[PDB]
Design a protein around this nucleic acid. Structure first.
Lengths: 49, 60, 166, 48
DNA sequence: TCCCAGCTCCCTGCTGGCTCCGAGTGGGTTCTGCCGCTCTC
RNA sequence: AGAGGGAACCCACU
DNA sequence: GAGAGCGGCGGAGCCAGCAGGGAGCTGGGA
């Protein structure tokens, strides 16, 4: 119920850290799967001209 | 303590092997030549230096 | 510091006393380990004379900040003569144990700031690491599942609907 | 050498079995269910 | 001549095995067999 | 007058 | 005997493989 200007109350700080950890985890995770998909697509259709 | 248990076990194994080999001929052994401090000392040094937490033969 | 102090004080002695006695025979030979002794850290030169080794000297000369370990062994011999002769080899050297810095068995234990500066050591240095071949090494705590307690889980594609483990 | 001497006809089977391991592991070290080729210090060989 | 019971053969379902798992880059460290026993000066 | 190796592991950057 | 050199000591998803289960023909007897 508090803005960033008023300051998050320590329970709100902990819950906000719990929320942001999910985004950090997703950013760390999705890269390998996307890179594998890109490599497979390119190796499938590299010579179509 | 996890390392020291196995390393003391290896020290006891080497002491037993040397003592059995020496008394199979019937002679009485000596304790200082039976104990090799190299196992404990170099094993602890290796496990702390390299970070491979185990024996030298099993790095994987 | 407390983990290493408890290790040196209790766990080494407990591991030594916990190991079974050595029985080996034609004549019955028994080996028993009674008490351990750990000295202050020291360095033997090529002459063999022992001298106390400072952590700064260990860092500079690429040595290992370790202490000798001595154990008491009692050897009872039985040569089928119905009597046994017991021989004790007190303070038998069995290896070198590296010492965590600023622990209760370090040479920097309990020293004042002036003494630390005279030994060329930072008073603000917290300690808690090992010097192995001159390099400072730190042991990182490892998480593991707790023991001796019953847990109940459920797997997705396993044949077991509910499993309990201990 | 053992073929010239003749051996005992089961040492030949043992040596061919060990020769089979040595030749195949040079081509492929990652055979499942078999011991890995070892030269030194707990590090397996790098096959072709 | 013809009706059954037994053998033959193909499909279906299941289990075990094998291969894969982002692109670059800058530092650091340890390790590169060892005990031994015949052999040589 | 072009020396001059390698593997493993850890930490870090985008 | 010292020096020494070599001899020995995790998870996910396509294929192979087997096993069990019906059609279907064939010899024996109605």
């Amino acid at each position: 119920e508090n803005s960033y200007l008023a300051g998050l109350t320590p329970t709100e700080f902990f819950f906000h850290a719990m929320g942001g950890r999910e985004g950090l985890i997703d950013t760390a995770v999705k890269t390998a799967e996307t890179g594998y998909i890109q490599r497979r697509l390119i190796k499938s259709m590299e010579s179509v001209m | 303590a996890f390392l020291f248990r196995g390393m003391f076990k290896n020290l006891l194994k080497e002491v037993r092997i040397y003592a059995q080999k020496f008394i199979d001929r019937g002679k009485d052994f000596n304790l200082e030549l039976a104990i090799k401090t190299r196992i404990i000392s170099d094993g602890l040094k290796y496990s702390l230096a390299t970070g491979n937490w185990g024996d030298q033969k099993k790095a994987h | 510091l407390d983990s290493f102090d408890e290790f040196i004080q209790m766990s080494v002695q407990r591991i030594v006393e916990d190991a079974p006695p050595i029985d080996l025979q034609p004549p019955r030979y028994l080996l028993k380990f009674e008490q351990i002794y750990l000295s202050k850290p020291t360095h033997w030169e090529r002459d063999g004379a022992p001298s106390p080794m400072m952590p700064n000297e260990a860092r500079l000369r690429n040595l290992t900040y370790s202490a000798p370990l001595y154990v008491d062994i009692t050897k009872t011999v039985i040569k089928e003569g119905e009597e046994q002769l017991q021989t004790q080899h007190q303070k038998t050297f069995i290896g070198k144990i590296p010492i965590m810095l600023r622990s209760t068995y370090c040479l920097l234990n309990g020293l004042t700031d002036r003494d630390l500066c005279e030994l060329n050591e930072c008073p603000l240095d917290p300690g808690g690491y090992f010097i192995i071949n001159g390099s400072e090494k730190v042991l990182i705590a490892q998480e593991k599942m707790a023991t001796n307690t019953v847990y109940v889980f459920a797997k997705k594609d396993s044949k077991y609907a509910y499993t309990g483990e201990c | 050498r053992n073929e010239q001497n003749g051996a005992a006809a089961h040492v030949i089977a043992e040596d061919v079995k060990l020769l089979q391991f040595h030749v195949a592991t040079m081509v492929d070290n990652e055979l499942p269910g078999l011991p890995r080729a070892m030269q030194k210090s707990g590090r397996p060989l790098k096959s072709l």
